[PDB]
Design a protein around this ligand. Sequence first.
Ligand SMILES: *C(=O)/C=C\c1ccc(O)cc1
Length: 125
Amino acid sequence: MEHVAFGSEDIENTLAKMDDGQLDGLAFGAIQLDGDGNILQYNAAEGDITGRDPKQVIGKNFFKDVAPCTDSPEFYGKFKEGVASGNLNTMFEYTFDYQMTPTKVKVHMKKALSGDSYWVFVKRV
Ligand SMILES: *C(=O)/C=C\c1ccc(O)cc1
């Protein structure tokens, strides 16, 4: 396992060194989005959480296609406020209920080290 803790204050530095193969080693789910909500990386442990297979969701829009539960002021609203501000660091609980058994999760959204990319981290609660 790659040793990184969910909610780590420097998680965006640690993950900056990580390819898709190492993202899959994470103890929690991890999705990289660009400013428009497009999935750039999506890890296996999120796959286990949501049941989505990863190679298939890369390049789809998270807010519009993949995850519609998140299209609301409480998820997507925050994400968009953050994109436009150029800074994002928020944690909250949420339920995923699209085409799946309702699963409660802790979400952490953080701006990445690189310019126009954002992390979504996810873990069971
Ligand atoms: C709720 O948002 C529904 C589904 C879903 C699918 C994949 C991921 O990563 C999160 C949520």
